[PDB]
Subunit: 185 residues, 4 copies
C-alpha cells in the first residue's frame, strides 16, 4: 500500500512510506475497515471548502477511481490538491470520462466543468473572462479548442496531446480548486 | 546516518551523502560527542534571526524530535528552512501536538502560532490581515477552518486532509519563518 | 518503450510507465502500426495551435528525431511543451543543426528562429523588444552572443556552454511556444 | 565520469548520462586530452558574459575544484548557472574558503564578493540597496549576520547553518550571476 501508493504517484508524492504509514495508522483509528464510502469522502470536501458546494466535485473524483481504500483516498487528495496539473493528465481523462466508456463527450465536459465551477466562490466568479464565466461557455471553449462538433467524441490520445501541447487547453480543463482560483488574482 | 537522513528527507534533501558527510566532519569538530543540547540548538536560531525572538520556536522544533543527534539536527534545519510546506505535513503534526499525546488541542495550536509570531519582525506585523494579526486570531481562524469547538481535538488524519486539501489552511499553519514573511510582501 | 521513454526523459517525464502504457493503448487504436508520419505529426500542431502557423516548426521537431514511433512522439511532445528548457539542451542542439552535420551554421539558426516566430500570434509580436522583433534580428543577436562571424560554425560544446552559462542566450534560443509567449506578458 | 558526474550532482543535474556522453564526445573534439586549463576556463566566461569582467570569478570557481577534467568542468558550469543555491551550500563553502584552509576569513568573503560584483553590469549596480552597493558593504553585512568580529573565522558548520536557516544570508552570499541580477528587477 505505502510503496504501492508511492509507486502510483511516483513524482507527485508529498510523503515518504514512513509518513504514509503514520497517516494510515491514524486513518484506521477513524475507519477500522480501511475503506471510506462516497458519503464519507464528500464530507471531507464539505468540511474543508466551506465557501463552495463540493458535493458534485467530490462525487466525480470518487467515481474516477461502494468505497475507496486508503490508497485511492490518498491519491484522490493528491490529484485535487498537490502537484502540477500536467503530471495528472491520465487521471484527468478518467475524471472527464464520466461514464467510463473510454471517450469523452461534450456533455461529460460540461458536467465536470459545472462541478468545478461550484468549487469557486461567487466572489472569485466575476473575476473570470467573459468567454469563460459560465459552465457552458467554459465547456464550449474547451470543445472548440479540440476542434469538436457537438456530436463528436474525444479519445484519450487527443486529450493528452492537446492538454500537454497547448497550455491554454490545460488551463481550461484545470480541476484543482486552488489553481482555478490563483489564475485570476 | 547520511543515507538514514537522505532516507528520511528523501525529496526534501538539499545535500548528497558526500556533502552530508562533509558537514558531519565539521559538526564533530564543534560537538565531538555528535549530540547537540536544546540550549545549543536555540543558540543557532538566536544567532541567525537577530530581529526576532526564536527561543520558544527553537524549543518546539527541538521538542518535535536531552539532545539531538546530527541526523535530527539536519532534519530540523530542513523542516524550518527548506522545501515546500506540503511535503512536511507529518512532521508539522508532531510540531503542533505539543505534549505528544497524539491529538492537537486548541491550546497547542495557540502555543505554536504564538512562537511562530515571535519569529516575525514587528515591522512585517502590520502587513498582516486584520483577522490574522494576533496569535489568538490566527489560532481561532485555524480552529475554525477545521470546524472545531474549543473543547474538541484534532487527529492526524484530519490535520493532513485539511492542510493538503485546503491551501488556505496550509498558509495559516505555515511555520517556516521565511514563507510566513514572503506571503505578505 | 515505456521504461525506454522514462529512461530518455528521466527528469523531464510527466508520466509513469503505467500512464505511458495507457496512452500507448489509446495511440494504437488510432495508429495500429505504432508509427506516425510527418504529415500526421504536423496535424497535431495545426489542430492545437489555431492562431499560429506550426507547419515549419512541427517539421523541424519531427526532423530532430519517414515516421516516428510512439517513443519519439512522446518525447517530441515533452520537448516542445513540458519541463525547463535547460534540461533539453542536448536535444535543442539537434533541433538547431538542421542538416544534422554536427555543427550549427548561421543559416540554421535563422531557419529555426523563423519557424518559432511563426508559432507566435501577430498580437504577441509587437510586445517584442526592438532588437528581437524579426527572425533576422533574433538570429543575429544569438549569433552575436556566441561571438560568431557569418562564416563561422557553432559546435555542440560551445552551444551547451553558452546556453547553460548565460541565461540571456537560453532565452533567445527558447523554442517552447508557451515560454516564448510568457516571457513578454 | 557520466555516472560519476550524475552521482555528484544528483538532484542538480540538467543532463542524462547519454546527453553527458554526447557533450563529452564534443568536448574531446575540442580538447583531445580531456583536460581544460584555467586560461581556457576563464575564456568561456569572458566569451559568454560580454558586459562584465568574469576573470576573477572564473579563476575562483576553477580554484574551488593545473587543469580541470570534464567532470569538474561540467559541475562548475552547473554550480554557476543551474539549480537552486541552497543545493550548492557545501560547494559554496569551497568557493569562499579561498586558501582552502578549512575556515573562511573576512578577507576571503571580501575577495569572492568583489569577484561576483564584477559580474554585475554597472547598469544593474545602482539598483542595489544602499547597504549592499559596494563589495565592502556587502561583505560586512555578511560578516555581521554571522556575528563575526574582523579577527574571527567561520567554520563550515556555521556557514551551512546560517545560509540554510536564514534566507537573508543566502541572498547575500549568492554567487550565480543571473540570480544576483534577477533579485533586483
Ligand atoms: Ca464517456
Ligand atoms: Ca496534544
Ligand atoms: Ca548543420
Ligand atoms: Ca580560508
Amino acid at each position: 500500500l505505502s510503496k504501492e501508493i508511492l509507486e502510483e504517484l511516483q513524482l507527485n508524492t508529498k510523503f515518504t512510506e514512513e509518513e504514509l504509514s503514520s497517516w494510515y495508522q491514524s486513518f484506521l483509528k477513524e475507519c477500522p475497515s480501511g475503506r471510506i464510502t462516497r458519503q464519507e469522502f464528500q464530507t471531507i470536501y464539505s468540511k474543508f471548502f466551506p465557501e463552495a458546494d463540493p458535493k458534485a466535485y467530490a462525487q466525480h473524483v470518487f467515481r474516477s477511481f461502494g468505497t475507496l481504500d486508503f490508497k485511492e483516498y490518498v491519491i484522490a487528495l493528491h490529484m485535487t490538491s498537490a502537484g502540477k496539473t500536467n503530471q495528472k493528465l491520465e487521471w484527468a481523462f478518467s475524471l472527464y470520462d464520466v461514464d467510463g466508456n473510454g471517450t469523452i463527450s461534450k456533455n461529460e465536459v460540461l458536467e465536470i466543468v459545472t462541478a468545478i465551477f461550484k468549487m469557486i466562490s461567487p466572489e472569485d466568479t466575476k473575476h473570470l473572462p467573459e468567454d469563460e464565466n459560465t459552465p457552458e461557455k467554459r465547456a464550449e471553449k474547451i470543445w472548440g479548442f479540440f476542434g469538436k462538433k457537438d456530436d463528436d467524441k474525444l479519445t484519450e490520445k487527443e486529450f493528452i496531446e492537446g492538454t500537454l501541447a497547448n497550455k491554454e487547453i490545460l488551463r481550461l480543463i484545470q480541476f484543482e480548486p486552488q489553481k482555478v482560483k490563483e489564475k485570476l488574482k
